[PDB]
Amino acid sequence: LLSEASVNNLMAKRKADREHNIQPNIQLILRAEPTVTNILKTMDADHSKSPEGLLGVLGHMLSGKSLDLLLAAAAATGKLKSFARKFINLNEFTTYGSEESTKPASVRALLFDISFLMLCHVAQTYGSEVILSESRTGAEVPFFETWMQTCMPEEGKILNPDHPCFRPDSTKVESLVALLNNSSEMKLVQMKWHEACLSISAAILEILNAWENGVLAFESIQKITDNIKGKVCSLAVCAVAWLVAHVRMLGLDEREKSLQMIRQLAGPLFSENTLQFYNERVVIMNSILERMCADVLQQTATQIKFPDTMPYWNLLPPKRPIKEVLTDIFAKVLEKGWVDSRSIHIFDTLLHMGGVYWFCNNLIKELLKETRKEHTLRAVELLYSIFCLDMQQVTLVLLGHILPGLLTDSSKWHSLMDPPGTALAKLAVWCALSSYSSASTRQKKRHREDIEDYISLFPLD
Amino acid sequence: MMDLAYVCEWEKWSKSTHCPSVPLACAWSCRNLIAFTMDLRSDDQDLTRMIHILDTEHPWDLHSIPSEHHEAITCLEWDQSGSRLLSADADGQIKCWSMADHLANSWESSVGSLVEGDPIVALSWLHNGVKLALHVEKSGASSFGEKFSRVKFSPSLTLFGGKPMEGWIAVTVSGLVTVSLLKPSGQVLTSTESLCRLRGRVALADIAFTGGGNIVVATADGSSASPVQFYKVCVSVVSEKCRIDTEILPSLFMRCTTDLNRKDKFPAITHLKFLARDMSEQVLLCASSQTSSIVECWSLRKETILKWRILSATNDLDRV
């Protein structure tokens, strides 16, 4: 894009200005991205279906923030969609399993485990829609996408575990709850990961039934919960997940007893069963279990201490009305002269949960404090982006009930004056054209269920 | 046999148009006093917020009350007697309408309550504990004691004797509840508290008493994916204020969705109520789509200790 002729004198001036072993992430990204591209290419063939070279590569490429090096690059370049697309079929390959001896099947188990760890942070950081393809032909559906819609309780979304998908069978979970009582598994040469994962959700229901019954030895249960974290801790995560689901409809007085298993499931690490690369796997699943169980830990005031990567989560007051804490951030952002990425997630749950007709009514009356045109125009320019967060709805609710509500009475247009009337008229015409031309997953979520009779509201005279 | 009495109609008053219409509610006194309203939108807002009182012998000399409100009235109820009123609406603005000087066309209300930034999803009065039983089987009993005898429900929170206290409670649209009780003196005690840690949208709710001065409430978010939680009210005035303890009842999920045939039909809840006031073991729950409606009755009979169960349903329904 730029010629090198204007580069050289700029180099001279830059050295003049700058004249007046801590490796930065700049070059780290710079030679990370060739590695990102060639790994993204070779996972299509799975190292020509030879897992020993892949195991060596993932052993060498497992330094500090190695997964983050590819996640940031693929999200930045927009190729994270292919990153999620290809590992879905890799999980299709590795959940069923072929005939192997104990160590190639252990490598297959770690193929099931690592790629699970490579994608759960994508779900808990970059959202859920980046994983889902939303188009799969036939009944040969991936296991990971059925897991995707049913496993994790989010901060704004809770599972509804009464579904028949949550309870596939009851004869298999008897074998699941019986084989855990005996000894170590020694069975993963062909065990059908997908069939075990869904049966774990009711095997742990049987476990909590036997625990509340008290007819079993508790140290045997300790042996059980230390057995499931020995070699493959993915089944431990599956045991955590539906326990987290089953917490929710239980009352707060009825929740801490099951946590005795949960605190045993992901407490201190378990030694003497390391296949390979085990210490870092516990650390990388701790961040997954932190956010997946956050909506329980805010309710159940308990500690599990899994081991920060916790950027935007729940700094709100618990009982204060949201009016005053909603209003005061806008003035501080205006006086900053710029908007903070911290406040972007702060306003997000607000505009999620309250209801937009209330939010517009709060801000419109606060628009009527101004006499300086630049001072109100900054607020109008900020409100342009704030309304562009849901432009498709504010282009219909500003013109729908606000503008009729700005003219119905007589004295109410006394506020409509030279700074604010002109500023609001410019604000409307910025949004109107953009809606004629035609930004979050949560906006897609909240726009699904609601239906409204627009003719009943507006019969077009 | 069904009879139609009359229709009393103002001249140049009908055909409301060019306005989003609102569902309306009606109220009736212990006496023969209908309290009603209508949405008009005729160059003023108070016509929607207008109160009409009609004495039962002369439907023309109507008593008119211009109840000024910032939001339109949603639920209208009287007192158990014919002395007090309520015009429920969003963000408080609730008064207490007492009768004025034993006329037929005179009211006043100098007291009330208000809550800021929180619409109200359910509301009810307090309880008196006086009730008798009607026996049509005792037509030939030839005594008023036989045909009419008290069942003696427990009066709610009898302080300074057997007199139950006077007041009302309400559940707001968010995770918040309010209580206001009139003293034996002229003062009023009002309290407001978060109902639990979970503060959230509540599309529908209902409030019903139990024997002993406690109150069971219902919830309905409207997201069609949440459990229908139930909560209990523990009245306790600790020497300056009524500190209320809250706890979660054994709740229920919803039917006509686990059959897996069609589950996103009737996508939003439209009706959630108890069968009758002062009792909370029988729930009407109706979901209406743009075409029809489906209604379910749930019963709190003990087998969980508090489990709800289906009763009956008719052949077909329209939008109720």
mmCIF file of C-alpha atoms in Angstrom, chain A residues 1 36 67 177 245 254 342 374 381-382 421:
data_model
loop_
_atom_site.group_PDB
_atom_site.id
_atom_site.type_symbol
_atom_site.label_atom_id
_atom_site.label_comp_id
_atom_site.label_asym_id
_atom_site.label_seq_id
_atom_site.Cartn_x
_atom_site.Cartn_y
_atom_site.Cartn_z
ATOM 1 C CA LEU A 1 0.000 0.000 0.000
ATOM 2 C CA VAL A 36 -1.102 -20.664 12.651
ATOM 3 C CA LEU A 67 -3.497 -21.326 22.122
ATOM 4 C CA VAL A 177 -22.646 -45.943 37.699
ATOM 5 C CA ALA A 245 -27.396 -28.067 35.707
ATOM 6 C CA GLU A 254 -30.413 -28.131 48.946
ATOM 7 C CA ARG A 342 -14.663 -1.599 29.867
ATOM 8 C CA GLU A 374 -21.329 21.253 21.095
ATOM 9 C CA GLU A 381 -22.871 11.496 18.687
ATOM 10 C CA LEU A 382 -22.290 9.006 21.516
ATOM 11 C CA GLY A 421 -34.159 19.804 18.464
#
